[PDB]
Symmetry: D2
Subunit: 279 residues, 4 copies
C-alpha cells in the first residue's frame, strides 16, 4: 500500500533513540532517517545494534539520502563512491530500496562542464547500486527563487526526463515532492504517465502561496494550504507507486504545536488523503 512515513522536519527532535520512539508511539511503520544519524550510531554501537532499534520498534527505513557530495573534487568523490555499497547494504537491511538526491534548478558554472560531470557521477552512483537492486531517485526542484543563477538546470519532471538520457543508467528515476510538482505547474497526468519503477520516493507538504511565490524553505503541513494533494497522490497511485510518502516540511521557524501532535495529525491526514486518492 502507499503509506505515511515520518520525516525529521516534522518533529522537534535530534536524538536518534527518541526520534525512533516518537515514530512508534505515533503509529508509523516507515521512517525517513538521514544516514549521518544512522552512521553516528553504527560507529558507537556497531551495525547490529542499529538494526535492533528498528526491529524492536516495528520500523522500516524508508530511504537513503545519497551519502556523498556530487560536487566534490574527483579524488574525494571517488573515495566516497567506494564507500557507497556498504552504506547502501546497511540501509537495505533496515528496509530502504532507494537512494536519492536533489538537483539544483540553476547554477553559475558552465553547462557543458557542470551537466556532463554530474551525468557521469550519477551514472557511477547508479551503477554501484545495480547489484543491490536499488534505484536512484533524483528530486527535481520547482520553486522559482532558486532559478536566478547564471544558467538553468532541471526545474521540472520534463527536464528531469531529458537528464535521464545523459545519465544513461536503467535504475534512475524521480523523487517526486508535491512542493515541486506544484511550483513547476504540473498536472496529475504528468505523474500518472510515469512508469511505476520511475517513482522512487515521494514527498508530501503544502503552501498557501501561488506556484511562482512558494519558498522551498518555508513549507506547511500537508493539508494546511492550497496544493491539490488528492490528484497528486492519485496520479502517483495510478503510476503504480506503492510505498512511503514522507511529509518533508522544510521550515525556517518553529512549526505549530508539539513534535508528537504533529506526527499524529499528519499520519491521520495522509491516511485520509491516500484513501481519497485510491477512491
Amino acid at each position: 500500500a502507499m503509506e505515511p512515513c515520518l520525516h525529521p522536519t516534522l518533529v522537534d527532535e535530534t536524538s536518534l533513540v527518541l526520534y525512533l520512539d516518537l515514530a512508534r508511539e505515533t503509529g508509523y511503520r516507515y521512517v525517513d532517517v538521514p544516514f549521518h544519524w544512522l552512521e553516528a550510531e553504527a560507529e558507537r554501537h556497531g551495525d547490529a545494534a542499529v538494526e535492533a532499534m528498528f526491529q524492536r520498534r516495528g520500523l522500516v527505513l524508508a530511504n537513503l539520502g545519497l551519502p556523498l557530495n556530487l560536487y566534490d573534487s574527483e579524488p574525494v568523490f571517488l573515495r566516497e563512491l567506494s564507500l557507497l555499497p556498504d552504506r547502501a547494504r546497511l540501509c537495505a537491511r533496515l528496509g530502504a530500496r532507494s537512494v536519492t538526491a536533489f538537483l539544483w534548478p540553476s547554477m553559475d558554472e558552465e553547462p557543458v562542464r557542470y551537466i556532463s560531470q554530474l551525468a557521469r557521477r550519477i551514472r557511477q552512483v547508479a551503477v554501484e547500486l545495480l547489484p543491490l537492486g536499488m534505484r536512484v531517485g533524483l528530486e527535481y526542484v520547482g520553486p522559482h527563487h532558486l532559478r536566478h543563477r547564471r544558467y538553468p538546470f532541471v526545474q521540472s519532471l520534463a527536464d528531469l526526463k531529458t537528464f535521464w538520457e545523459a545519465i544513461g543508467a536503467p535504475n534512475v528515476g524521480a523523487l517526486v515532492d508535491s512542493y515541486h510538482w506544484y511550483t513547476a505547474g504540473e498536472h496529475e497526468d504528468d505523474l500518472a504517465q510515469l512508469p511505476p519503477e520511475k517513482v522512487v520516493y515521494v514527498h508530501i507538504n503544502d503552501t498557501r502561496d501561488a506556484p511562482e511565490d512558494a519558498h522551498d524553505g518555508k513549507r506547511l503541513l500537508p493539508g494546511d494550504g492550497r496544493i491539490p494533494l488528492v490528484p497528486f497522490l492519485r496520479g502517483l497511485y495510478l503510476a503504480g507507486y506503492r510505498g512511503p510518502v514522507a511529509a518533508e516540511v522544510l521550515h525556517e521557524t518553529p512549526l505549530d504545536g508539539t513534535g508528537e501532535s504533529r506526527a499524529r495529525l499528519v499520519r491521520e491526514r495522509l491516511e485520509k488523503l491516500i484513501a481519497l486518492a485510491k477512491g
Copy 2:
C-alpha cells in the same frame, strides 16, 4: 526480519482465493504464488482485483518464478522476454523483489552451446529487470540422481558463482534451498561469506537421507529430518538476508495431515528455527 513464507506444496490447494485465505488464516504475511495463478486471475478480473486480494488479506507476494522458458526457440524466447517487464511490474506491486529460476545439474546438449546460450539469455532477463530494481536468483540444484546425463552443469554454489561470470549481469545471485545446500555437502560458512545482495530468495525443507541419496522430488517438512537447519539459517542471517523463507516441500505422494495443520506447524517451526539462528 527473516520470515516464514507459505508455499503451494505445503497445502493441498489449487484455488487461488482459498490458498490466499489459508495464508491469512494460518498467520502468514509472505506468500509464494506461481505467476500462472496470478495471471489466470489478472485475465479474468484485471490487475487491480488481484492486488485487492493481497491487500484485503495483509499479504505480500514473496517472489516471481521467471515466467518464460530459457530453453525455447529464439523467436518464442524473445517474445516472452518482451512480455517480462509488465509481468514483473505487476508482481513488484504485490511485493515481490526477485525473479528466480533453477539450473539443471546435468544435460545432454553440447556444453559450449548450452552454457553460452543460457548465459546470454539470463543476462538479457537480468537486464530487463535492472529498471525495476529487481534481482535474479538462480537456484543451484544439488541432488545426485539429476547428475547422470552426458555432461555436468551447476551442482553447487561454487559452480553457480563461476556461472555468474559468464552471465556478467550485476543483479544476479542465488536462490538458496536447504535441500541443495545439504545435497551439495556445503557448510554454514559457504552461505555466510555471500554478499547479502546475492541471497535473493530462500527455500527450507528436510530429509532423512544422506546427501548422496536424497531425492529432489521426495522432501519432508522443515524439521522432520537430519539437515542442520539452524546453521543453514544462521549462515544466511550472517550473510545479511532479511526476507522470506519458503517451505518448498516437493513430494510425489500426499504429505501427512491437512493443508491447514501443515501451514500452521511449519510457520511455528520456522519462527523457532529463525530465532535460534539469530541467537
Copy 3:
C-alpha cells in the same frame, strides 16, 4: 607516419573520378571524400566498383563524415542511425577507421534538454560503430563569432573532454582542427597529453587574424598565416597520432591559383611541416 590528405575545399574538382585522379596525380595516398559522392557512385556502379576505383589508384579513404543529423526529430534520427552500420562498413572497406561530427559552440535550446539528448545520441552512434573497430572524432569549434547564441556549448578541447563524460562511450575522441586549436588559444601540450586513440582525425589550415578575430568560413592554406603549425603537429605526433592530416580550408571566396597547384603545393609544405614536427 602522419601523412597529407586531400580535402575537397582545396580543389575545384566536384566529380569523384576526377577528384581521385587529381589526388593520384598530385602524390597523395589519403583522400577525404564527402560521403554523398560515395553513396552516389555506389548507386550507379555498385560496391565492388567504388572499391576498384580507390585501390587502382593507390588511394585510402581518410574518414567518414557522420551521415545523419544529430539534431533531427527522434524517428528520423533513429532511421538514419539504423542505416549507419552498412554505410560505415562500405567506408571501412575503403580504409576509413573514423567517423566525425562537429559540435555547435552555442545554442538557443535549453542546456539540459540539448546536452542530454545530444550525449545520448552520440552514445548511440558510438555503440553502433564498436563492432566495426571504428571511432567517433568529435570536432570542437573555437571561433569567437560562433559563440553568440543564447547558451554556451563546446568551445575548447578542455570542454570537449568533459563532454566525453556525458557521452560515456569508450570509442569517442576528437577531431582536432588547427583553426580551432588556435582560436581556443590552446598550447602544444594540451594536444600532447591526449591518449593517441582520442586523436581520431586532424585538419590543418591557417589565418593572419588574431585568435579573437579569425572567421570560421574564411580560412587560408597552411603556411600562409600566423598559427604555430609545427608545434601543432609535434603535439599530435607525441600524443601518438599516425594517420591522415587533411587541409580543410573553408572559404566563401576562391583561393587563387588552380586546384592542381594548391593540391600539389599543400602535400609538399605538409610533408616538411611533418618532418619539422617529428624532430
Copy 4:
C-alpha cells in the same frame, strides 16, 4: 583487397630486421610478426625505431597475437591485462587492427568453471580494446586429434558463434584458418554469411589428408593439397573481408626449398588464388 601476409612459419629468418628485409624483397606489404620480437626491438632501440623500421620498408603489421595467457591465475591474468593497452597501442601504430587468440577444442576442466571464466576474461580483453578501434579474432581449431580431452569445447565456426554469446562483447570475431574450415567439414557459404567485421584475420595453408586425418602441427604450403582454397577466399571475399591473408604452415619438420623461395612463391600463388576468388 585481400593481400598476402608473410608468416614466420614460412621462413628460416628469426631476426626481426632480416625477416622484414625478406618481406620487402619478396614483394609483401603485410607482415605477421610475433609480438615478442617487437617487444624485444622496442627495448633495445625504442618505440620510434620499430615504427621507422616498418615504414621505411613499406610494411604494415597484420595482427597482434594476444600477449597474455587466458588460462593463467587471476592475479597474473589481471596484470597482463593491465599491460595490454600500451602493447595494443604500439601495434596500432604499426598498422595492426586485430588481436587474436585460439581456443582449445577440448579440456579436462569442468565446463561450467572453464567456459564461464574464459568468456568473462575474453570479454575483459575486448573491453580494453574498444577505445582503440580494435577487434578480437578468436581462432576455432578443427583437427580431430585435438578433441580427445575429457570435455568438448569449440571445434567449428558454428560453435565459436554460440561462444560469442557467452562473451557478449561487440568487437569479438573469428580468426578463420583454412586448416580448421576444412577439418570442420565446413562449406563456402558458412564463411560468406558472416558480417565482414566478424572476419578479424585469416590464415591459409594446405594438406593431402582427409578432413578426419589432417594433423595440426603437420600442414603444407597452400596449393600443395586437397582443400578448396578458391571457395575459401570467395566466401571470405563475399563476406566482405579486405585485409591480410597469412600463410600459417606449422610444421615439425623442415619445408623443402629455402625461406626466400617459399616466401616469394607463396605471394604469387596467393595473388592468383585471390583473383580466382574475386571473380
